[PDB]
């Protein structure tokens, strides 16, 4: 299993720090959050 | 959480081993030794890959042709199946014709 991804936490943290002040599961679940940060921008 | 909570053990590397200090030596043996010797036969490895590159299908055909006789039964069956599949894919599938 060579060449695995190791900074996926930091990518998710970028999207979630833009999603932090939301309401519901969209401030912490990456899928629902990334579908809303796009609309915010 | 797929990330380490502690630092990994330090990977110390010695740049001056036997192998690292003497990598590449004798690689000009043909052009510096009256062409008695070839780098292709300096290469050490499997007997069916010494001075020969090939793609995957050609590698499988060469392996079956060269060491297929002294090969294990299920390994030979797997190699025959792989050759059949690679023939079908390379000759029948793809974007460019």
């Amino acid at each position: 299993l060579r060449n695995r991804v190791t900074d996926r936490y930091f990518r998710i943290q970028e999207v979630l720090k833009h999603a932090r002040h939301f309401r519901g599961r969209k401030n912490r679940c990456y899928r629902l959050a990334v579908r809303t940060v796009i609309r915010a921008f | 959480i797929g990330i380490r909570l502690t630092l990994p053990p330090p990977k110390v590397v010695d740049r001056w081993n036997e192998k690292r200090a003497m990598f590449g030596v004798y690689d000009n043996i043909g052009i510096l030794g009256n062409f008695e010797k070839h780098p292709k036969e300096l290469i050490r490895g499997p007997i069916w890959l010494r001075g020969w590159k090939g793609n995957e299908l050609q590698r499988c055909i060469r392996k079956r042709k060269m060491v297929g006789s002294r090969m294990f039964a299920d390994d030979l069956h797997n190699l025959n199946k792989r050759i059949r599949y690679l023939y079908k894919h390379f000759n029948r599938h793809g974007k460019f014709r």
Binding site: H18, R20, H21, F41 | -
Partner: protein, 107 residues
């Protein structure tokens, strides 16, 4: 996004420019490495441009620390207690000069 970020009003530090202008940059700390290919441009900046900058800004103290590091950095400390750390990793001398003059012009 404005709604997810802090905000403030337009202001000066101590009514700056009324009686006199005081440069709000106080200190510049340059962490540079001797053998870093990342620190090559910072090394050229220390060789050529930091002396002229220090002469042009006598109110700013410039410390240069040559120590083994992978990412060369600059810390700008401002009179109201402000700290701004920037990476000068793999930047050329003109980009580093632009960044340092930007830090001098900032409050």
């Amino acid at each position: 996004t404005a709604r997810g970020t802090p905000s403030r009003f337009l202001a000066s530090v101590l009514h700056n420019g009324l009686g006199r202008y005081v440069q709000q940059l106080q200190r510049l700390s340059f962490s540079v490495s001797r053998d870093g290919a990342s620190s090559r441009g910072a090394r050229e900046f220390v060789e050529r441009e930091v002396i002229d900058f220090a002469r042009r800004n006598p109110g700013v103290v410039i410390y240069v620390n040559s120590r083994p590091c992978c990412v060369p950095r600059v810390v700008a400390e401002y009179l109201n207690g402000a700290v701004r750390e920037e990476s000068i990793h793999c930047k050329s001398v003109e980009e580093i000069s632009t960044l340092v003059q930007k830090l001098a012009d900032q409050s």
